Design a protein around this motif. Structure first.
Motif, mmCIF file in Angstrom:
data_model
loop_
_atom_site.group_PDB
_atom_site.id
_atom_site.type_symbol
_atom_site.label_atom_id
_atom_site.label_comp_id
_atom_site.label_asym_id
_atom_site.label_seq_id
_atom_site.Cartn_x
_atom_site.Cartn_y
_atom_site.Cartn_z
ATOM 1 N N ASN A 140 0.330 -1.551 -0.149
ATOM 2 C CA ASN A 140 -0.232 -0.097 0.231
ATOM 3 C C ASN A 140 0.618 1.241 -0.292
ATOM 4 N N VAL A 141 1.856 1.220 -0.810
ATOM 5 C CA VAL A 141 3.286 2.265 -0.639
ATOM 6 C C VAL A 141 3.660 2.275 -1.228
ATOM 7 N N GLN A 142 3.699 3.276 -1.943
ATOM 8 C CA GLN A 142 4.505 3.628 -3.016
ATOM 9 C C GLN A 142 6.628 3.770 -3.228
ATOM 10 N N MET A 143 6.838 2.475 -3.008
ATOM 11 C CA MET A 143 7.984 1.712 -2.761
ATOM 12 C C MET A 143 8.971 2.063 -3.789
ATOM 13 N N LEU A 145 15.783 4.440 -7.307
ATOM 14 C CA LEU A 145 15.046 4.716 -7.846
ATOM 15 C C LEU A 145 13.707 5.000 -7.759
ATOM 16 N N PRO A 146 13.177 6.780 -8.349
ATOM 17 C CA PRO A 146 11.927 6.500 -7.694
ATOM 18 C C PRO A 146 10.517 5.790 -7.776
ATOM 19 N N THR A 150 15.270 6.252 1.102
ATOM 20 C CA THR A 150 14.298 5.609 1.017
ATOM 21 C C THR A 150 13.008 6.585 0.690
ATOM 22 N N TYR A 151 12.813 7.667 1.835
ATOM 23 C CA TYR A 151 11.702 8.785 1.666
ATOM 24 C C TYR A 151 12.176 9.777 0.251
ATOM 25 N N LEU A 152 14.168 10.026 -0.115
ATOM 26 C CA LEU A 152 14.066 10.764 -0.873
ATOM 27 C C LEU A 152 13.321 10.092 -2.219
#
Ligand SMILES: *[C@@H]1O[C@H](CO)[C@@H](O[C@@H]2O[C@H](CO)[C@@H](O)[C@H](O)[C@H]2NC(C)=O)[C@H](O)[C@H]1NC(C)=O
Ligand SMILES: *[C@@H]1O[C@H](CO)[C@@H](O[C@@H]2O[C@H](CO)[C@@H](O)[C@H](O)[C@H]2NC(C)=O)[C@H](O)[C@H]1NC(C)=O
Ligand SMILES: *[C@@H]1O[C@H](CO)[C@@H](O[C@@H]2O[C@H](CO)[C@@H](O)[C@H](O)[C@H]2NC(C)=O)[C@H](O)[C@H]1NC(C)=O
Ligand SMILES: *[C@@H]1O[C@H](CO)[C@@H](O[C@@H]2O[C@H](CO)[C@@H](O)[C@H](O)[C@H]2NC(C)=O)[C@H](O)[C@H]1NC(C)=O
Ligand SMILES: *[C@@H]1O[C@H](CO)[C@@H](O[C@@H]2O[C@H](CO)[C@@H](O)[C@H](O)[C@H]2NC(C)=O)[C@H](O)[C@H]1NC(C)=O
Ligand SMILES: *[C@@H]1O[C@H](CO)[C@@H](O[C@@H]2O[C@H](CO)[C@@H](O)[C@H](O)[C@H]2NC(C)=O)[C@H](O)[C@H]1NC(C)=O
Ligand SMILES: *[C@@H]1O[C@H](CO[C@H]2O[C@@H](C)[C@@H](O)[C@@H](O)[C@@H]2O)[C@@H](O)[C@H](O)[C@H]1NC(C)=O
Ligand SMILES: *[C@@H]1O[C@H](CO[C@H]2O[C@@H](C)[C@@H](O)[C@@H](O)[C@@H]2O)[C@@H](O)[C@H](O)[C@H]1NC(C)=O
Ligand SMILES: *C(=N)[C@@H]1CCCN1C(=O)CN[C@@]12C[C@@H]3C[C@@H](C[C@@](O)(C3)C1)C2
Ligand SMILES: *C(=N)[C@@H]1CCCN1C(=O)CN[C@@]12C[C@@H]3C[C@@H](C[C@@](O)(C3)C1)C2
Ligand SMILES: *[C@@H]1O[C@H](CO)[C@@H](O)[C@H](O)[C@H]1NC(C)=O
Ligand SMILES: *[C@@H]1O[C@H](CO)[C@@H](O)[C@H](O)[C@H]1NC(C)=O
Ligand SMILES: *[C@@H]1O[C@H](CO)[C@@H](O)[C@H](O)[C@H]1NC(C)=O
Ligand SMILES: *[C@@H]1O[C@H](CO)[C@@H](O)[C@H](O)[C@H]1NC(C)=O
Ligand SMILES: *[C@@H]1O[C@H](CO)[C@@H](O)[C@H](O)[C@H]1NC(C)=O
Lengths: 729, 729
Positions: B469-472, B493-494, B528-530
């Motif tokens: 449920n997260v855009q990893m 990579l985004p 990861t957040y970046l």
């Protein structure tokens, strides 16, 4: 208008230089002055000069000479080199003595290297100096010294020099010795710091130093063990005739010996009469002793009939300390600035053996200082003129008739000159007036016999010319009324200031006790750039606690630092908003040292008024600051005295409210005065509650952050921050 | 896509937690595991468990138990509390022992408070502990302790514990004690720091502390006087209450004694045989002694015919120090990872009696560690699989035929699992595999006889379901070629990465010698957040000097720190900047400790590739850093060794070049490792050349800046800085 503005580089690079006229009186008729690195001697009466010392005479010296001083009899010159700064006033240097008559240097019995202080006797050419914390006396420049003390001990016993706190907060000087008027006696204080705790901090030094050094300084914080002090007098005329001359002690009065105390003033009255003022650690009680040499016992006696008590019911004693007496020639009476019954500081006249004095001035304004005293006249500076507490003029009062008061400076140039200081020749035959605003500085020479202007010494026309080409800011000095009381303010206003428009405002704050930030002085500073180039209004405000307006105002913060002086700054910004030319979305605050404290307190108040602010070297908690200064206003941090308020007035306890503002915190790491500790605790408290802010440390910079590179770097860093705080989306 | 991204708060508040499965083998068959604060014992073959200790047995203990240590026979449990951190590994604590048979706390002969180290014997329930720098032994938990050493002296003599540099750079542990396999003997080192200079720095403590304290730590900077070391063995079976215990010294070999040296390894071979390795201060020469107990002498003899010399011609010895030997059951031979003739790290088989070893593995890849040894198989981890230096698998090699190598982990789940570590039971009958990437961690249990996968211990099933449920972000691992050599990099990579869009790029750098920043490990960190929220690509690159690829790469920076590894980073960024999806106007760089150094050197390189960067606790000048690490790579900073390069490799010398970049410099004031000094000198050099930059100090934070509030604060501040750097005109 298409003239250039006064820019940041102009300030940082000193493009527009204020010319000074610094002279040194060597007699009643003559002064010395530096013209193109030559030293000229001037006849005051006629203005003719001659070369006293050619700029070439010390090329063969081998060292860059820092400063010089001439023995009073004109026979010798003291050359100072290897200057190394210590604290605000202290430094060490090497010294050679040049014989002006043989036109040769003296190579025998030289003043040692690492000398801490040296002074000529006031007449002749005797020298007293302090080295490794002990006092030495030379009767003749080429002859061996007589040692006066053997107790000297680094960081522990200081003879004839102050320790850290006495230097900063009591004497505003390093030296603690006092020659008698004709040089027979040498008086001196001795400071014992045995039980005074050490402030410890890192100093990193040149990159080449592998391990940082720890600087350790005896420094009493609030409520800690203070240095103790003793006072002695030696007869230097007895030196060459006795093996080891006796230093006669003059003990403090009983009313002082019951507790912690300070020596706060030493002043010779005659050849055989010295006056001392002592101050209790609770600084609302002081005692003056007046002591006579007893020729048959070789002792110094202070008759209780001659003891004068100075106390305060509403605050501390004096502006920063009890003031100095000025004795008439015979030493049987003296003049002294004291707070009158209405709370205004005025000149009181004392007979040495009568307790009640007579006021010679009075009114709702203050005497700033007594400048000279002759048999007929006393000269002093006040802020009387036009009821302006931020102005200064020289006055002359007739001793045989107190109703005869002439203002010597008031009307010389009233538009250009509202702020004066003065320098009298040796027996007050001539005087230099130094005007320092609101226009460009103006230095003039005058003769006392008739108070006639002799000549303009320096008028700064060169600078004036340059400044025509520049879009200079203006200054407004005015007042606003709060609870039937006048409170003064100043504004550095952008050029072409338009009341119809809204301007960003920076509140430039200091606001310590007896401070004054609203005045008539002309300044070329960071504010000049901000108003001129960035179109910011830079304002300052003298609220409760500020000086030169009576005790009602000054003592309002007694025992209550961090209250009225803080809230009055916030109220000032509100009042400036009401004035209608202020963008109330762009109000900033900044200050240094006490100003840093106040800024931080204001930013942590939750007032909503300020968008952002900069604290430089702030106090953060009164218990971190020195005893003498802090206790003067706050008393002792103990449950039975004032601890509750010490604990209630910290910046740290307001950390949560910094969520509402943009904060920049700056501090030199080698600040011996306001310790880096103080900001280290602010930053920790801010991190602890999750507040983002900006920070800058300055490695190895002290309280002044005044090294050439650091000075430019800090003002550059602050300019960016202000501009960021202010610019529009 | 309506799903939430992985935010800064998620990283800081640990919203998504990796599940672990930390077991402790107690026998060949069984292991302990903490579940619900209960300690359970598991049978490895079947998976069944019992309670070993209920989560409530200590409900009225009156202290929070920091940790526990069950004696090897299961009869006692050591309770740790009052934990106070010292350095990376050191701490003090209080201890109580609970008897599992008696079901009660032991109340006599208690382990003292402020205990520095404690450990059970390897078998049974003897205890050895260090207190006030001295060693004590208890044969039984309730009995008086025998005092083994009497020379312990704070900051001066260390018995059975390491000083600062030995803890950090040699043993990666505080303990300097080594029990023999059955507890008969206790070996220990003694450190003497008498002439090691102290690093000194301020500690501000809580707000209530009026004067900051000065912390003083024996810490040798490059080239300074090092600690000296002695080694001892004591028989714990023959201790007396009457007489002082006798310790037998084993002196270092003559080839070490000729100069400064270190003790770098202690490994028991049998009940009566111990090996030690010694390392010269010039860290390219080490020697192993193998010492046998002599029953009639009561002494320890290390035969010259059993010395083994290990040296390097291209660099230092071992990755960070000479590797540990793995002895056979009879102690007559051993296996050891050493650099082969091609410069790749492989397993060599030695006879204790013979000078030449035999490599049992070979190839252009490296053995990471020897993990377990039986008479039939040696088990190890290597990066052989698919020729990927940043992947790790478990292999076994048949001791009777070296051509028979089996990968035990490679094929279990190749898509999810390319990076393994392993934990073996007492006689290698069972092993636990810990997969840590590229997918979510996976813990499995296996048996050695036929390498059966018994069961899944923990598959992180729950986390997987949350993460859906997260855009990893994803991770790309790949390589570039320079002068014919593969160098690996990774990019975070985004989500929804689009090869046709241009992304800003952050170079996450460490790049210390033997480092690896390009790997198959799964991580939830700042990067990861970046990537997920800010759409920044976060790249890391392993250039010259990096580990696990042979000495030709690793030793490239020998004697030349701040050269090729800085250059290679710039070159990687240069190559990234020419890729289609990288915005060349927005490339940043950051790093911590060695990464802060490299980041700083890169920003000061004048390359023009980077717009901005952040250095956290950087080294700035190799002479400020510790001897053991610095000299390993740099030699000595003397004119006759390597001083010129010590002086050519400072950040300070490059200050001018920062004029064209944005720099944030961050450091904890209580960093004992990389001293605040290092950043203080950077800031001062930047001030001296007129460069503006951003700074943040963390009051009383050490090297980890890890207190929960500081950790949130630093990452919040760095996030603002990167976001501002990458914000588009
Ligand atoms: C000059 O006189 C002073 C005062 O007596 C001497 O200083 C004393 O010396 C003794 C012994 O060395 C100490 O125990 C005292 O404490 C000292 N007193 C003080 C007040 O310092 C000094 O030594 C004499 N100098 C010479 C050269 O004889
Ligand atoms: C400076 O003042 C001192 C102190 O009064 C003078 O010394 C005294 O001089 C008188 C001579 O009129 C003698 O009777 C005393 O014995 C002296 N007292 C002491 C303590 O020395 C001194 O003569 C004056 N110096 C000069 C140069 O005028
Ligand atoms: C000097 O200051 C102190 C503190 O303000 C004064 O001490 C207080 O005096 C009043 C009246 O006796 C007492 O009620 C307080 O309890 C005292 N406070 C203390 C000791 O902390 C002292 O009286 C002042 N001196 C003068 C002349 O005003
Ligand atoms: C720790 O090392 C120091 C030297 O670094 C030893 O002190 C020396 O001891 C010898 C013999 O006692 C003396 O002759 C030297 O003068 C001492 N040198 C210094 C610099 O003090 C000390 O003995 C060692 N301690 C232990 C327990 O081994
Ligand atoms: C641990 O190993 C030691 C050392 O081999 C054993 O102690 C020896 O045992 C033999 C055989 O019984 C004795 O004859 C020796 O005198 C002992 N040597 C020493 C140095 O004490 C010991 O038995 C072993 N411990 C256990 C619990 O098995
Ligand atoms: C360990 O490293 C040192 C330093 O690089 C080596 O010493 C050098 O050896 C060469 C050839 O013998 C000399 O020409 C250099 O002058 C030496 N350098 C220094 C700084 O002393 C030493 O040889 C190395 N040991 C090994 C086994 O390679
Ligand atoms: C300055 O001049 C002095 C000369 O005295 C005469 O100066 C004339 C200009 C005139 O005003 C006369 O009335 C004066 O009597 C001389 O004695 C000084 O030595 C000179 N001083 C210096 C410093 O040069
Ligand atoms: C774990 O199991 C043991 C019980 O016996 C097992 O025997 C196997 C062959 C199989 O049939 C299982 O179903 C049985 O349960 C016992 O001895 C251990 O003590 C048990 N418990 C532990 C180690 O905690
Ligand atoms: C900063 N202003 C610090 C913190 C509060 C007190 N302050 C001082 O430095 C106090 N010392 C003096 C007192 C007066 C006014 C200023 C100059 C000085 O020379 C005389 C010393 C500050
Ligand atoms: C920052 N990385 C500092 C400055 C350069 C070296 N470094 C260290 O802290 C050195 N100590 C170690 C050496 C290796 C790798 C890292 C973890 C460690 O436990 C083993 C200690 C850093
Ligand atoms: C020395 O004096 C002369 C003026 O008499 C002047 O021209 C010169 O500049 C001076 N030199 C220095 C170094 O100040
Ligand atoms: C001061 O220092 C220098 C040595 O640095 C020395 O040559 C000189 O003579 C010293 N001066 C005195 C007065 O001792
Ligand atoms: C300084 O004071 C200490 C006690 O604080 C005392 O022991 C010492 O003698 C004093 N030294 C002097 C007055 O020289
Ligand atoms: C540890 O500290 C506590 C609390 O001061 C004390 O009562 C106890 O005796 C100490 N333990 C030991 C073993 O000395
Ligand atoms: C053991 O050695 C120490 C220190 O050398 C000493 O103080 C102690 O008395 C000794 N004890 C015995 C029992 O010999």
């Amino acid at each position: 208008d298409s003239r250039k503005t006064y820019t940041l580089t102009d300030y940082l690079k000193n493009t527009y230089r204020l010319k000074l006229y610094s002279l040194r009186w060597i007699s009643d008729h003559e002064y010395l002055y530096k013209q193109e690195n030559n030293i000229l001697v001037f006849n005051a009466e006629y203005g003719n000069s001659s070369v006293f010392l050619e700029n070439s005479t010390f090329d063969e010296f081998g060292h860059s000479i820092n400063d010089y001083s001439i023995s009073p009899d004109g026979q010798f010159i003291l050359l100072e080199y290897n200057y190394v700064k210590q604290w605000r006033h202290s430094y060490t240097a090497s010294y050679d003595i040049y014989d002006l008559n043989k036109r040769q240097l003296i190579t025998e019995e030289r003043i040692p290297n690492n000398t801490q202080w040296v002074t000529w006797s006031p007449v002749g050419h005797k020298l007293a100096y302090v080295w490794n914390n002990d006092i030495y006396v030379k009767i003749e420049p080429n002859l061996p010294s007589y040692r006066i003390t053997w107790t000297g001990k680094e960081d522990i016993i200081y003879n004839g020099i102050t320790d850290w706190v006495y230097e900063e907060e009591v004497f505003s000087a390093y030296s603690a010795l006092w020659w008698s008027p004709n040089g027979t006696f040498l008086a001196y204080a001795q400071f014992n710091d045995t039980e005074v705790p050490l402030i410890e901090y890192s100093f990193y030094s040149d990159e080449s130093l592998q391990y940082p050094k720890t600087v350790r300084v005896p420094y009493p914080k609030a409520g800690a063990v203070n240095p103790t002090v003793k006072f002695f007098v030696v007869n230097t005329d007895s030196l060459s005739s006795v093996t080891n001359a006796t230093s006669i002690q003059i003990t403090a009065p009983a009313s002082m010996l019951i507790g912690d105390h300070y020596l706060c003033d030493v002043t010779w009255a005659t050849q055989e009469r010295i006056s001392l003022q002592w101050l209790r650690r609770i600084q609302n009680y002081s005692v003056m002793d007046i002591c006579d040499y007893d020729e048959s016992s070789g002792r110094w006696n202070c008759l209780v009939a001659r003891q004068h008590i100075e106390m305060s019911t509403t605050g501390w004693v004096g502006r920063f300390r009890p003031s100095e007496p000025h004795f008439t020639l015979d030493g049987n009476s003296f003049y002294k600035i004291i707070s009158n019954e209405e709370g205004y500081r005025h000149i009181c006249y004392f007979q040495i053996d009568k307790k009640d004095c007579t006021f010679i001035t009075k009114g709702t304004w203050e005497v700033i200082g007594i400048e000279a005293l002759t048999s007929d006249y006393l000269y002093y500076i006040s802020n009387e003129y036009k009821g302006m507490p931020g102005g200064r003029n020289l006055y002359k009062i007739q001793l045989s008739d107190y109703t005869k008061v002439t203002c010597l400076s008031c009307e010389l140039n009233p538009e250009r000159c509202q702020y004066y200081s003065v320098s009298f020749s040796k027996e007050a035959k001539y005087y230099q007036l130094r005007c320092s605003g609101p226009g460009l500085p103006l230095y003039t020479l005058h003769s006392s016999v008739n108070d006639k202007g002799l000549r303009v010494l320096e008028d700064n026309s060169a600078l004036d010319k340059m400044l025509q080409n520049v879009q200079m800011p203006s200054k407004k000095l005015d007042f606003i009324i709060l609870n039937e009381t006048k409170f003064w303010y100043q504004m550095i206003l952008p050029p072409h200031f338009d009341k119809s428009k809204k301007y960003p405002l920076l509140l430039d704050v200091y606001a310590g006790p007896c401070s004054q930030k609203a005045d008539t002085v002309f300044r070329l500073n960071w504010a000049t750039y901000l108003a001129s180039t960035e179109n910011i209004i830079v304002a300052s405000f003298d609220g409760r606690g500020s000086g030169y307006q009576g005790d009602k105002i000054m003592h309002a913060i007694n025992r209550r630092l961090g209250t009225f002086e803080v809230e009055d700054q916030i109220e000032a910004a509100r009042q400036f908003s009401k004035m209608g030319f202020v963008d109330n979305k762009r109000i900033a605050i900044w200050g240094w040292s006490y100003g840093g404290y106040v800024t931080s307190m204001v930013l942590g108040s939750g007032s909503g008024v300020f968008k952002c602010g900069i604290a430089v070297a702030p106090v953060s908690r009164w218990e971190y600051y020195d005893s003498v200064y802090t206790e003067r206003y706050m008393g002792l941090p103990t449950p039975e005295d004032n601890l509750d308020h010490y604990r209630n007035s910290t910046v740290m306890s307001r950390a949560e409210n910094f969520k509402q503002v943009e904060y920049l915190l700056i501090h030199g790491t080698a600040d011996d005065n306001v310790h880096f500790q103080q900001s280290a605790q602010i930053s920790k408290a801010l991190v602890d509650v999750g507040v983002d802010f900006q920070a800058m440390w300055y490695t190895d910079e002290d309280h002044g952050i005044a090294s050439s590179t650091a000075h430019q770097h800090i003002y550059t860093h602050m300019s960016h921050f202000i501009k960021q705080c202010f610019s529009l989306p």
